[PDB]
Design an enzyme around this catalytic site. Sequence first.
Site, mmCIF file in Angstrom:
data_model
loop_
_atom_site.group_PDB
_atom_site.id
_atom_site.type_symbol
_atom_site.label_atom_id
_atom_site.label_comp_id
_atom_site.label_asym_id
_atom_site.label_seq_id
_atom_site.Cartn_x
_atom_site.Cartn_y
_atom_site.Cartn_z
ATOM 1 N N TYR A 186 24.732 -5.254 -13.266
ATOM 2 C CA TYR A 186 25.250 -5.383 -14.609
ATOM 3 C C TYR A 186 24.266 -4.854 -15.643
ATOM 4 C CZ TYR A 186 27.312 -7.924 -18.638
ATOM 5 O OH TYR A 186 27.877 -8.260 -19.843
ATOM 6 N N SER A 217 25.310 -5.414 -24.016
ATOM 7 C CA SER A 217 24.856 -6.717 -23.664
ATOM 8 C C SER A 217 23.373 -6.790 -24.012
ATOM 9 C CB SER A 217 25.133 -6.968 -22.175
ATOM 10 O OG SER A 217 24.071 -7.412 -21.411
#
Lengths: 252, 251
Positions: A157, A143
């Site tokens: 995350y 990501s």
Amino acid sequence: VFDLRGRVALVTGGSRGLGFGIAQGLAEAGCSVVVASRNLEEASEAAQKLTEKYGVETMAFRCDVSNYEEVKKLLEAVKEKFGKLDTVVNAAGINRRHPAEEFPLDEFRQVIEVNLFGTYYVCREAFSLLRESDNPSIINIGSLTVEEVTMPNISAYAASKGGVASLTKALAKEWGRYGIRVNVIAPGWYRTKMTEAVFSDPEKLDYMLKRIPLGRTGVPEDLKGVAVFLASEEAKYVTGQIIFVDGGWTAN
Amino acid sequence: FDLRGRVALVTGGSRGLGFGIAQGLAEAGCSVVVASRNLEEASEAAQKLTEKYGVETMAFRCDVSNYEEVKKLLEAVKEKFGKLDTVVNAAGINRRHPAEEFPLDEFRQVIEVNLFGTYYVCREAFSLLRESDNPSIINIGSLTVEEVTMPNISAYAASKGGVASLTKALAKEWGRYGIRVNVIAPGWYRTKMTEAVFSDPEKLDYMLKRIPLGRTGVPEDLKGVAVFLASEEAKYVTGQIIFVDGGWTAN
Ligand SMILES: NC(=O)c1ccc[n+]([C@@H]2O[C@H](COP(=O)([O-])OP(=O)(O)OC[C@H]3O[C@@H](n4cnc5c(N)ncnc54)[C@H](OP(=O)(O)O)[C@@H]3O)[C@@H](O)[C@H]2O)c1
Ligand SMILES: NC(=O)c1ccc[n+]([C@@H]2O[C@H](COP(=O)([O-])OP(=O)(O)OC[C@H]3O[C@@H](n4cnc5c(N)ncnc54)[C@H](OP(=O)(O)O)[C@@H]3O)[C@@H](O)[C@H]2O)c1
Ligand SMILES: [Mg+2]
């Protein structure tokens, strides 16, 4: 060239979204595909769509990647169906959004359990088959948070994805001697179930688009090429890399 | 770069790099809370800070992988000092195994200490840091943020890349409260954690080849950067990973 016929791929999180997009890319190039998620009907539906559209052999298997014993069973099932494994795509992931100072501790660990521990468990258990491949390739899904945390409330995350990046480097280092390549595809911003809420806020979406030189957000198809490339013998000298597919986000 | 009147919490402050950093902060006038799993070692380290530098100290036993113990550590800081300005998350472990054979409990344990523990400390320190006019959290990374030079350290590497991204997430969220969050990423320093590497002449020779400054690090090398980042003179520095590595990452 870029032919994956006769190859076998395992795609965790292959039942929808970015993992499904990648699974389609690999199947289109001739790869047999194993779809793993926590919902067996959804995995089976995705697997069946792959066989119907691309004519490849598929298998669906229910697995929570944060559960090590289930991962061990997932990999034993691949070995039984196919006897071989060439490509692993670790696309299984979750997100939970809270201010870091209020983040429930069980949720904080859970996001890392799925995203980071689960990605490790799958790599670990895939190793003995991957060592038998003449073209072994592990593709972890990062990501933007590997590099930069563009949104608030995603501490767990972000942590998980930075961990995946460094894990990827470690594995690349240790397993290069066995010819096993380990790389990350780090997507930019793609509308999926995971990012629905962000995409539903026009102020956030307008901000996102201002930071994307290509002028749009990503679609699952945008990942198909880089996945096939990294799986293929055409990327045999590529390992330990974090490749952003983000429309230029990280360049500006 | 005066830290007089400031209070720092240093996990892993009982020895090695955390201790060197604690000394740096104390020398600049900071009061220091030393936290580690061994109360004797923490207490002795704290007393050495007070003796040498004349600052107020406290030692408190805490396993940072245990959230309730971390909560209690921060209550203890508030009780002793009523304030906190600086957090140094130096508590860390390593376990060395080939990735394909790494025991699953040890894999998790390294991340529990190094990453979850760093998070818990940051989380629990927030309410005091919010009250500071100069709040600075300093997380300890590693070269493994950027590159994994040794085999057999997959869990550790994952933990430290986790720390780097966590740091950025906190910097992002807490910038609005004026809380800076940065990483000091040391290169190679002879400590209890790295002794086995340093004891192999082949590995040490290789390491020195990759260090432009021609030597490995000592705990004193980290004092300046810790003081700098804690100081009011680093108020516009946040979300950064700063390598103190003799040039390792540049070559
Ligand atoms: N969308 C983006 O902008 C974006 C950007 C960067 C990275 N990513 C990453 O891309 C990956 C795929 O996400 P997405 O956006 O495609 O979201 P998604 O549509 O919600 O897909 C996530 C997939 O992971 C599965 N999954 C979640 N937890 C699992 C677990 N414990 N075990 C097995 N499967 C699990 C889901 O199936 P089940 O729910 O049935 O288990 C689903 O197949 C994740 O790693 C995510 O972090 C997404
Ligand atoms: N030395 C290097 O070349 C190097 C390079 C990069 C990064 N680092 C990092 O620098 C930091 C300091 O390590 P070091 O090299 O100084 O090793 P060290 O001498 O072994 O020090 C580790 C410190 O952490 C404490 N600790 C370990 N686990 C803990 C836990 N669960 N809770 C609280 N305290 C804990 C230790 O005390 P107790 O055992 O008494 O708990 C000790 O004070 C670590 O984060 C390490 O990863 C070191
Ligand atoms: Mg950037």
